[PDB]
Ligand binder design. Structure first.
Ligand SMILES: [Mg+2]
Ligand SMILES: [Mg+2]
Ligand SMILES: [Mg+2]
Ligand SMILES: [Mg+2]
Ligand SMILES: [Mg+2]
Ligand SMILES: [Mg+2]
Ligand SMILES: [Mg+2]
Ligand SMILES: [Mg+2]
Ligand SMILES: [Mg+2]
Ligand SMILES: [Mg+2]
Ligand SMILES: [Mg+2]
Ligand SMILES: [Mg+2]
Ligand SMILES: [Mg+2]
Ligand SMILES: [Mg+2]
Ligand SMILES: [Mg+2]
Ligand SMILES: [Mg+2]
Ligand SMILES: [Mg+2]
Ligand SMILES: [Mg+2]
Ligand SMILES: [Mg+2]
Ligand SMILES: [Mg+2]
Ligand SMILES: [Mg+2]
Ligand SMILES: [Mg+2]
Ligand SMILES: [Mg+2]
Ligand SMILES: [Mg+2]
Ligand SMILES: [Mg+2]
Lengths: 73, 119, 101, 88
RNA sequence: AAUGCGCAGAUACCGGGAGGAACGCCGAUGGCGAAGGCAGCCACCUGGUCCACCCGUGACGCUGAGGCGCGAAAGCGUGGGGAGCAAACCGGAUUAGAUACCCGGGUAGUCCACGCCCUAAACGAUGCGCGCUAGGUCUCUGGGUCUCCUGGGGGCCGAAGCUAACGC
């Protein structure tokens, strides 16, 4: 059980240090602005650690959010 | 007396009460209700029924402004948070949408001893 | 000298007249500290992820210079002075890290 | 930081013969470069104790080497010092 | 439940502002450091460390009484700060009592600078270094002809052996 789709699979090629590729970094956050776990991102220890540092830079630039409202219920 | 038609329903749920606030399309409240506004004095206020009543009360006081549709917004986890939502879905008031916006810190103020327990 | 990327976000409600005046003050402060712009990418207005300074959008400026480290902080400081300058993020250049690719 | 050009100039200046990258002089010279850059760092950032632990070690490694030199060749020793400015 | 707070209009809601402290998700199933300990992001300054090449020196090594430095929290001095929290303390309630546990308040303190204090279940309750003795498995990090192999670190199960036993 708990079988979703991996974020890495859906993407093709991309630089984990590009803190401006919103269109692609967005794919790494939840319905909420939270940074997806590794079970969802499919990244590796090392990569996930860089992604995190990148998503955070874009957030400071106002390109990515810190948190969004959950719509549903 | 301003015929607003559509607005926002705010459900403030907590383990002690549920307070509902209906507002106009941009935040300003029209009418509100709560577990205490409906007679429940003690802890009955936290009960889910009190929520259901508080919501219904809120909606009725809203229809008085010709309110038809509204966007719900929940904050809190306490009981009756769900009855409050359902109440509004049975109150003729069209629930345009439901959104959870509970405020959560990015770790700031040291919580009360009560809310720290095992951290 | 080392490679940097001076990011600057500015007021999106600016006309062609000021848009340039500020770019001048900017392109000037770089020279003031020894910044040889190796290349630039002036994107422009973009829908922000959240409002900065009550504004739902911001005008972006990206440079790739090479200046004296000891002055990277004063350069970044100065730039922040302008009111039409909402953000100033000077990261250090790095090799891209490919993945899934 | 100490750059390759910076370091390279120190190595050749003390090498005992072309290509000597590890003799007692080269080492002591190199450690002295580090020790000084660090002593300067600590004039400021005085609360930087962690870094100061590295200083003690370098300083210690240096005296250990010197002590060896001074024992094997008391000449090169008194020579290495005069050229630097250690043990004063 | 009560104290408390609210018609000098609170709670709930929207907008603006001030300030202090902490730093969500990523986060561990981890990482770094000699220990204490260390996680928003950026720049600077700076320490340790691992690997490959096996190029240089050539035993220059190990340990370390005393000395010296570092050393969580609380605490002390001087000055500053003060959101939230909270010893004392002031109240409410519980109780046979209640100098407690629960609730409403609250000062020191918690924060910063500088100086001091030097303690801990400062724990792996396991000084440091080196050599030698089956493997299996998971993992962090580097090299490689990248099934699998090779080095460093983190866990687990287990050969021989050890151990009063537990266990190692
Ligand atoms: Mg009145
Ligand atoms: Mg309030
Ligand atoms: Mg407000
Ligand atoms: Mg204040
Ligand atoms: Mg260790
Ligand atoms: Mg610890
Ligand atoms: Mg280093
Ligand atoms: Mg050799
Ligand atoms: Mg020889
Ligand atoms: Mg020793
Ligand atoms: Mg000895
Ligand atoms: Mg101490
Ligand atoms: Mg203290
Ligand atoms: Mg004090
Ligand atoms: Mg004080
Ligand atoms: Mg004061
Ligand atoms: Mg309190
Ligand atoms: Mg209390
Ligand atoms: Mg202090
Ligand atoms: Mg002991
Ligand atoms: Mg590999
Ligand atoms: Mg191992
Ligand atoms: Mg570990
Ligand atoms: Mg056995
Ligand atoms: Mg046995």
């Amino acid at each position: 059980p708990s079988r979703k789709a991996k974020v890495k699979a859906t993407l093709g090629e991309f630089d984990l240090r590009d803190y401006r590729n919103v269109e692609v970094l967005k794919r790494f956050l939840s319905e909420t602005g939270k940074i997806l776990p590794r079970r969802r991102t499919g990244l590796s220890g090392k990569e996930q650690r860089i992604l995190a540092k990148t998503i955070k830079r874009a957030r400071i630039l106002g390109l990515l959010p810190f948190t969004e409202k959950l719509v549903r219920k | 007396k301003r015929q607003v038609a559509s607005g926002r329903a705010y459900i403030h749920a907590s383990y002690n009460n549920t307070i509902v606030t209906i507002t106009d399309p941009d935040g300003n409240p029209i009418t509100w209700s709560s577990g205490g506004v409906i007679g429940y004095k003690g802890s009955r206020k936290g009960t889910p029924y009190a929520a259901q009543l508080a919501a219904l009360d809120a909606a009725k006081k809203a229809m008085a402004y010709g309110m038809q549709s509204v966007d719900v917004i929940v904050r809190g986890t306490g009981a009756g948070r769900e009855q409050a939502i359902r109440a509004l879905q049975a109150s003729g008031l069209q629930v345009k949408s439901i959104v959870d916006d509970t405020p959560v810190p990015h770790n700031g103020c040291r919580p009360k001893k009560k809310f720290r327990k095992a951290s | 000298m080392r490679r940097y990327e001076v990011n600057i976000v500015l007021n999106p409600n600016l006309d062609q007249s000021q848009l340039a005046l500020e770019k001048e003050i900017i392109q000037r402060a770089l020279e003031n500290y020894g910044a040889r712009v190796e290349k630039v990418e002036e994107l422009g207005l973009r829908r922000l992820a959240y409002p900065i300074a009550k504004d739902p959008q911001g005008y972006f400026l990206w440079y790739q210079v090479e200046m004296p480290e000891d002055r990277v902080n004063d350069l970044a400081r100065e730039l922040r002075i302008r009111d039409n300058v909402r953000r100033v993020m000077v990261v250090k250049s790095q090799e891209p890290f490919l993945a899934n690719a | 930081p100490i750059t390759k050009e910076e370091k390279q100039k120190v190595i050749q200046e003390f090498a005992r013969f072309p290509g000597d990258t590890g003799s007692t002089e080269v080492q002591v010279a190199l450690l002295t470069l580090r020790i000084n850059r660090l002593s300067e760092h600590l004039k400021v950032h005085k609360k930087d104790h962690h870094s100061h632990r590295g200083l003690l070690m370098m300083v210690g490694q240096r005296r250990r080497l010197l002590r060896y030199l001074q024992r094997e060749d008391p000449e090169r020793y008194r020579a290495l010092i005069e050229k630097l400015g250690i043990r004063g």
